[PDB]
Ligand binder design. Structure first.
Ligand SMILES: CCOC(=O)c1c(/C(C#N)=C\N)c2ccc(Cl)c(Cl)c2n1C
Ligand SMILES: [Cl-]
Ligand SMILES: [Cl-]
Length: 348
């Protein structure tokens, strides 16, 4: 009656039920953890929900039990539900598969970008999403918590319905999201201040230099991740398209400038350095890639106007090498870039 595939995924499709309560009506996404399906909750007047069904594998089941505990603590802190985090409705162990029911939201910010053929979000959409990311993460940080896995894939629109607009300048159609309200998802890696901090955190492209250099990490990890995200929303391509540490550090250098000598002198990861400088093969396939494609951050500006200059100033401050020098989210919310927000956007 209950079937799992070779990888421990629960074999389930549209028309299937869980706990004689949740009825699967569609597929919303997939990750390494398993699957996310749309359900009608038959115990809640057929309420539409998103059900995250986790793989029947020990590592994933434990990571989901950790996420559940985090969502419960967040629920205790944000009673009013005004701090822009996914809202856990229920949770259960279903034959070895952990399942987390959430209030149904729209597409994640990466999927909307992918479906808009990587055509970037306009600056006003980027501004409101930044303001909300800064606000949402400032709350969790104030509660002694660090997300660690912020990435476009983990940010969801409350509603992803869009308007198809013909971009005159590109001679093609563009999908413009009608409502830029977002929510932060995936607390499977979220760590409290007093808990054990793994040496390595974050998805590579969104990994800060202090994690690469094994200098320990805290709340500033998330600020770096946001800077990476805002760039990706602005240009539509990842800032650090890398699969390797040495190449990662070279990119950071080309785009942002020299790695502070204080971080070099402190790191135990000396293989990346020779004579106090980053060491790399300029003639390898990575060396050539970086030298051709990785330019100073400023060069990626699409327009010269005041609002574009401020996005780049905020992003640069989000991408400060030294976590101690990195802008805090409390300071970010004060940046002149957010003066361009509409009163509806500012007020929440
Ligand atoms: C792309 C991997 O994950 C997801 O599909 C996903 C995820 C998760 C997780 N974790 C992450 N992006 C969702 C979290 C909450 C809600 Cl309400 C929904 Cl709809 C979610 N979806 C559809
Ligand atoms: Cl520790
Ligand atoms: Cl990787």
């Amino acid at each position: 009656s209950v079937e799992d595939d070779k990888e421990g995924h629960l074999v389930c499709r549209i028309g299937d039920w869980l706990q004689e309560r949740y009825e699967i009506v569609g597929n919303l996404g997939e990750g390494t953890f398993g699957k996310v399906v749309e359900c009608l909750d038959h115990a809640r007047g057929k309420s539409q929900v998103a059900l995250k069904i986790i793989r029947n594998v020990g590592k994933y089941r434990e990571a989901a039990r950790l996420e559940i505990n985090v969502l419960k603590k967040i629920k205790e802190k944000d009673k009013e539900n005004k701090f822009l985090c996914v809202l856990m409705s229920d949770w259960f162990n279903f034959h070895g598969h952990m399942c987390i029911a959430f209030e149904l939201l729209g597409k994640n910010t990466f999927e909307f970008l992918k479906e808009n053929n990587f055509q970037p979000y306009p600056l006003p959409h980027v501004r409101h999403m930044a303001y909300q990311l800064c606000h949402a993460l400032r709350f969790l940080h104030e509660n002694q918590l660090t997300h660690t896995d912020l990435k476009p894939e983990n940010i969801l629109f409350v509603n992803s319905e869009f308007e198809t607009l013909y971009n005159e300048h590109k001679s093609c159609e563009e999908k413009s999201v009608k409502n830029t309200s977002i929510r932060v998802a995936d607390f499977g890696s979220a760590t409290f201040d007093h808990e054990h901090h793994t040496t390595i955190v974050a998805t590579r492209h969104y990994r800060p230099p202090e994690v690469i250099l094994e200098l320990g990490w805290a709340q500033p990890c998330d600020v770096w991740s946001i800077g990476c995200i805002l760039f990706e929303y602005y240009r539509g391509f990842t800032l650090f398209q890398t699969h390797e540490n040495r190449e990662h550090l070279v990119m950071m250098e080309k785009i942002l400038g020299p790695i502070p000598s204080h971080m070099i002198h402190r790191t135990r990861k000396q293989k990346y350095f020779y004579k106090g400088g980053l060491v790399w093969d300029e003639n390898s396939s990575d060396g050539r890639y970086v030298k051709e494609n990785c330019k100073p951050l400023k060069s990626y500006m699409l327009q010269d106007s005041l609002e574009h200059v401020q996005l780049f100033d905020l992003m640069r401050r989000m991408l400060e090498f030294d976590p101690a020098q990195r802008i805090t989210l409390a300071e970010a919310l004060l940046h002149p870039f957010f003066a361009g927000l509409t009163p509806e956007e500012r007020s929440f």
